[PDB]
Write an enzyme that holds these catalytic residues in place. Structure first.
Site, PDB file in Angstrom:
ATOM      1  N   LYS A 149       0.826  -1.189   0.000  1.00  0.00           N
ATOM      2  CA  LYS A 149       0.000   0.000   0.000  1.00  0.00           C
ATOM      3  C   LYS A 149       0.866   1.247   0.000  1.00  0.00           C
ATOM      4  O   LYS A 149       0.395   2.308  -0.394  1.00  0.00           O
ATOM      5  CB  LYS A 149      -0.950   0.006   1.220  1.00  0.00           C
ATOM      6  CG  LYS A 149      -1.244  -1.354   1.878  1.00  0.00           C
ATOM      7  CD  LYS A 149      -0.237  -1.732   2.983  1.00  0.00           C
ATOM      8  CE  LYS A 149       0.259  -3.185   2.868  1.00  0.00           C
ATOM      9  NZ  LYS A 149       1.580  -3.440   3.526  1.00  0.00           N
TER      10      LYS A 149
ATOM     11  N   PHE B 213      11.206  -5.169   7.025  1.00  0.00           N
ATOM     12  CA  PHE B 213      11.920  -5.807   8.127  1.00  0.00           C
ATOM     13  C   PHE B 213      10.968  -6.551   9.099  1.00  0.00           C
ATOM     14  O   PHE B 213      11.180  -7.721   9.425  1.00  0.00           O
ATOM     15  CB  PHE B 213      12.791  -4.761   8.864  1.00  0.00           C
ATOM     16  CG  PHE B 213      13.478  -5.282  10.109  1.00  0.00           C
ATOM     17  CD1 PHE B 213      14.672  -5.983  10.023  1.00  0.00           C
ATOM     18  CD2 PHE B 213      12.933  -5.057  11.365  1.00  0.00           C
ATOM     19  CE1 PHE B 213      15.304  -6.456  11.166  1.00  0.00           C
ATOM     20  CE2 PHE B 213      13.552  -5.536  12.506  1.00  0.00           C
ATOM     21  CZ  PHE B 213      14.739  -6.237  12.411  1.00  0.00           C
TER      22      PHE B 213
ATOM     23  N   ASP C  80       7.606 -11.353  11.128  1.00  0.00           N
ATOM     24  CA  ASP C  80       6.288 -11.766  11.537  1.00  0.00           C
ATOM     25  C   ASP C  80       6.071 -13.110  10.883  1.00  0.00           C
ATOM     26  O   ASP C  80       5.575 -14.028  11.526  1.00  0.00           O
ATOM     27  CB  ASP C  80       5.208 -10.767  11.104  1.00  0.00           C
ATOM     28  CG  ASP C  80       5.118  -9.565  12.027  1.00  0.00           C
ATOM     29  OD1 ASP C  80       6.179  -9.045  12.447  1.00  0.00           O
ATOM     30  OD2 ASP C  80       3.980  -9.161  12.356  1.00  0.00           O
TER      31      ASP C  80
ATOM     32  N   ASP D  94       5.519 -16.406  12.752  1.00  0.00           N
ATOM     33  CA  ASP D  94       4.104 -16.859  12.659  1.00  0.00           C
ATOM     34  C   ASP D  94       3.889 -18.027  11.679  1.00  0.00           C
ATOM     35  O   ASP D  94       2.754 -18.293  11.286  1.00  0.00           O
ATOM     36  CB  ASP D  94       3.140 -15.702  12.293  1.00  0.00           C
ATOM     37  CG  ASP D  94       3.216 -14.512  13.270  1.00  0.00           C
ATOM     38  OD1 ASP D  94       3.921 -14.591  14.300  1.00  0.00           O
ATOM     39  OD2 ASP D  94       2.571 -13.473  12.995  1.00  0.00           O
TER      40      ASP D  94
ATOM     41  N   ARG E 122       2.561 -14.045   1.095  1.00  0.00           N
ATOM     42  CA  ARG E 122       2.428 -12.626   1.479  1.00  0.00           C
ATOM     43  C   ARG E 122       2.364 -11.727   0.233  1.00  0.00           C
ATOM     44  O   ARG E 122       3.360 -11.604  -0.487  1.00  0.00           O
ATOM     45  CB  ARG E 122       3.615 -12.205   2.356  1.00  0.00           C
ATOM     46  CG  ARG E 122       3.691 -10.719   2.674  1.00  0.00           C
ATOM     47  CD  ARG E 122       4.632 -10.484   3.830  1.00  0.00           C
ATOM     48  NE  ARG E 122       4.067 -10.886   5.125  1.00  0.00           N
ATOM     49  CZ  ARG E 122       3.233 -10.149   5.872  1.00  0.00           C
ATOM     50  NH1 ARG E 122       2.801  -8.951   5.463  1.00  0.00           N
ATOM     51  NH2 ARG E 122       2.824 -10.618   7.053  1.00  0.00           N
TER      52      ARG E 122
ATOM     53  N   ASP F  30       3.126  -9.298  21.664  1.00  0.00           N
ATOM     54  CA  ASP F  30       2.226 -10.055  20.841  1.00  0.00           C
ATOM     55  C   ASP F  30       2.538 -11.561  20.960  1.00  0.00           C
ATOM     56  O   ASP F  30       1.619 -12.375  21.165  1.00  0.00           O
ATOM     57  CB  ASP F  30       2.291  -9.567  19.388  1.00  0.00           C
ATOM     58  CG  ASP F  30       1.026  -9.844  18.639  1.00  0.00           C
ATOM     59  OD1 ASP F  30       1.096 -10.450  17.548  1.00  0.00           O
ATOM     60  OD2 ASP F  30      -0.049  -9.471  19.158  1.00  0.00           O
TER      61      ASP F  30
ATOM     62  N   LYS G  79       3.475  -1.743  18.920  1.00  0.00           N
ATOM     63  CA  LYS G  79       3.686  -2.371  17.616  1.00  0.00           C
ATOM     64  C   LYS G  79       3.027  -1.608  16.460  1.00  0.00           C
ATOM     65  O   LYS G  79       3.677  -1.399  15.434  1.00  0.00           O
ATOM     66  CB  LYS G  79       3.357  -3.879  17.624  1.00  0.00           C
ATOM     67  CG  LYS G  79       2.021  -4.320  17.062  1.00  0.00           C
ATOM     68  CD  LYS G  79       1.991  -5.817  16.760  1.00  0.00           C
ATOM     69  CE  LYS G  79       0.544  -6.311  16.665  1.00  0.00           C
ATOM     70  NZ  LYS G  79       0.248  -7.112  15.442  1.00  0.00           N
TER      71      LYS G  79
ATOM     72  N   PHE H  13      -7.828   3.929  15.375  1.00  0.00           N
ATOM     73  CA  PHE H  13      -7.685   3.090  14.194  1.00  0.00           C
ATOM     74  C   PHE H  13      -7.934   1.666  14.549  1.00  0.00           C
ATOM     75  O   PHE H  13      -8.677   0.979  13.849  1.00  0.00           O
ATOM     76  CB  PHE H  13      -6.290   3.142  13.568  1.00  0.00           C
ATOM     77  CG  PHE H  13      -6.050   2.021  12.606  1.00  0.00           C
ATOM     78  CD1 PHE H  13      -6.704   2.006  11.382  1.00  0.00           C
ATOM     79  CD2 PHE H  13      -5.236   0.942  12.951  1.00  0.00           C
ATOM     80  CE1 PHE H  13      -6.521   0.962  10.493  1.00  0.00           C
ATOM     81  CE2 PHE H  13      -5.054  -0.111  12.069  1.00  0.00           C
ATOM     82  CZ  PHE H  13      -5.696  -0.102  10.839  1.00  0.00           C
TER      83      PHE H  13
ATOM     84  N   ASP I 246     -10.648  -1.279  13.256  1.00  0.00           N
ATOM     85  CA  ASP I 246     -10.129  -2.461  12.558  1.00  0.00           C
ATOM     86  C   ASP I 246     -10.606  -3.771  13.218  1.00  0.00           C
ATOM     87  O   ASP I 246     -11.147  -4.679  12.542  1.00  0.00           O
ATOM     88  CB  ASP I 246      -8.594  -2.403  12.524  1.00  0.00           C
ATOM     89  CG  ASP I 246      -8.007  -3.266  11.450  1.00  0.00           C
ATOM     90  OD1 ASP I 246      -8.320  -3.022  10.273  1.00  0.00           O
ATOM     91  OD2 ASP I 246      -7.223  -4.173  11.780  1.00  0.00           O
ATOM     92  N   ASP I 247     -10.427  -3.818  14.541  1.00  0.00           N
ATOM     93  CA  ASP I 247     -10.939  -4.884  15.387  1.00  0.00           C
ATOM     94  C   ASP I 247     -12.422  -5.099  15.200  1.00  0.00           C
ATOM     95  O   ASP I 247     -12.867  -6.246  14.997  1.00  0.00           O
ATOM     96  CB  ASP I 247     -10.645  -4.590  16.848  1.00  0.00           C
ATOM     97  CG  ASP I 247      -9.160  -4.683  17.171  1.00  0.00           C
ATOM     98  OD1 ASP I 247      -8.337  -4.997  16.251  1.00  0.00           O
ATOM     99  OD2 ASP I 247      -8.829  -4.434  18.362  1.00  0.00           O
TER     100      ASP I 247
END
Lengths: 329, 336
Positions: free
Chosen positions: A45, A86, A91, A95, A100, A162, A188, A227, A231-232
């Site tokens: 983006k 980075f 992640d 994860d 991606r 996290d 984060k 924000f 989003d949540d």
């Protein structure tokens, strides 16, 4: 229009990175690095980068905005995008991610593999070559360098908060507190999407007053909160639930739960069974979280605007107004 | 008692990591950081630290050596051990390693797993908290930071050459070349074992002439180049009571030298048995090294290199302390 204006200075950046350095004696590495940067920046983006540009364009006096100083804003903007590559790059590593932006993860590629952790180290350090090229002699230099080291720490703290959340024992939700939810968004998300670009903007426009950086900070963090809460909430009405994430909805739900309801939560959260998910979504309804969101969004928006409108003219209330509006709807 | 002198100040450093910074607001993450430091720094030689210290003590005009600067120096020492512990913790992950300095690797622990990449980043970033604490207000500061940033680049180039050489075509050793062995050691070892700790001493003792900086840089790499050839030798012909180079298929000085001296037939014998778990195979290689006369070569080159260095040291201007360098070359000449 601006996303093409931003992608246009990239090629130059990767030449600046493959030069004023020991890499001249090791051209092989230089070309392996270029490949890491182009891949791990490619796609997406470009927002955090654009936001860095956008910020300067609004806080500097226009008489002072030149041909060159737009190039520098696009640069800093780019430094931030490398910082993201980075993070997302590890992640995935942590994860177990497999793709991606369509393509597989950089670490899934056969010739790369777990090397990646070293490729991480290389990207980050690149930031500081670019800083040295275009800002070694300027007065803001140190601040810029400091501000990027500082960044790696914030996002690491946040990464830790996290992973530490995702460790846990499935059925233990004692860390699902608004106190700890706020720290996760602070460390984060917020910092490197809002504080960092803004703060990076201020410094190009030679805004340095401590209490102005503090007011800009406070604003960005109030903003990222706002924000995240959105989003949540949008995720529920996505997979937040079945993955047992610390959403604003998980946290609020647990505040309002009777002890019986708290058990329905721990039992059914974190599960793929539609019957289980449905149960959480129902318990959310019971708890009136939709009812609560719509009130909170309004208050938070209103108090956020009113915070912007009251800001010194040096901080472009304009800027901070748009930022907030962009996330509204 | 210098090692005891160095280890003594660790607690104060770790406190300073927590305190002044943001970690006040998140205590959970301050304590977890202590744990990653205490475990990933533990045991070891504490060598680069001690050099950083020693290099300062040796460079500075003794009138100015205060109780404070002794600390300041140790601190910069520790920032270096932090850099080390970081590099190793990753060098295990990438080289599927299991144990280091007697204990399990950090990532192999149960709760940790692949989070170790993050824990690494936290580790590295601590350096800058320490730097801000004790040096925020000082001319040099900017330079310590810049330098500690280069350090990560220089090193991770080093790491890249090693993990990219030893990751493709298992029978192909066409990259086992002196030219490339030497690049590897310059960036990955020489840099952070000598070049850095000295460059840190030089800063702490306000030494600035870029020519002077250069001559020390060269000095340090020649010492590093040497340092590493020893280690490579000892890891094959070590007295066990006082190594896995052959099994891990390392680009060791001996392997590079072997491959200059091999016939085609002796080359085919190398590709067969190098990087093998079996002690049946580990013996063929050490006997080949005996045919190719690498022991005698080493024994000669060690002596020459020493003598070369000892001279280069005296040829330094006094402002760089020939004493310092003479000594480091001593501390290593004859090892086990």
């Amino acid at each position: 229009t601006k996303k093409e204006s931003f992608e246009d200075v990239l090629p130059s950046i990767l030449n600046t990175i493959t030069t004023n350095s020991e890499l001249t004696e090791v051209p092989e590495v230089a070309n392996w690095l270029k490949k890491v940067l182009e891949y791990n920046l490619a796609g997406g983006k470009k927002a955090r980068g654009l936001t860095t540009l956008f910020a300067y364009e609004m806080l500097e006096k226009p008489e002072n905005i030149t041909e060159e100083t737009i190039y520098l804003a696009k640069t800093l903007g780019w430094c931030v995008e490398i910082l993201q590559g980075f993070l997302v790059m590890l992640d995935d590593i942590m994860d177990g991610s497999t793709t991606r932006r369509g393509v597989p993860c950089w670490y899934q590629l056969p010739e790369v593999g777990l090397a990646a952790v070293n490729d991480s180290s290389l990207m980050f350090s690149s930031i500081f070559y670019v800083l040295h090229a275009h800002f070694a002699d300027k007065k803001i230099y140190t601040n810029l360098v400091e501000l990027f080291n500082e960044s790696l720490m914030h996002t690491s703290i946040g990464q830790h908060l996290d992973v530490t959340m995702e460790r846990r024992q499935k059925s233990d939700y004692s860390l699902f507190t608004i106190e700890r939810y706020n720290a996760i968004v602070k460390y984060k998300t917020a910092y490197y999407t809002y504080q960092l670009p803004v703060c990076l903007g201020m410094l190009l426009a030679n805004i340095s007053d401590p209490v102005l950086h503090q007011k800009a900070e406070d604003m960005c963090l109030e903003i990222g909160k706002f924000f995240q809460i959105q989003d949540d909430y949008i995720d529920c009405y996505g997979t937040d639930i079945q993955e047992a994430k610390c959403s604003w909805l998980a946290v609020m739900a647990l505040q309002r739960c009777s002890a019986s309801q708290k058990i329905v939560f721990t039992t059914c959260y974190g599960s793929k069974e539609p019957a289980h998910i449905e149960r959480i979504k129902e318990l959310y309804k019971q708890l009136q979280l939709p009812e609560l969101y719509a009130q909170e969004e309004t208050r938070m928006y209103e108090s956020l605007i009113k915070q912007a409108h009251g800001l010194p003219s040096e901080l472009s209330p304009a800027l901070f107004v748009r930022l907030i509006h962009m996330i509204y709807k």
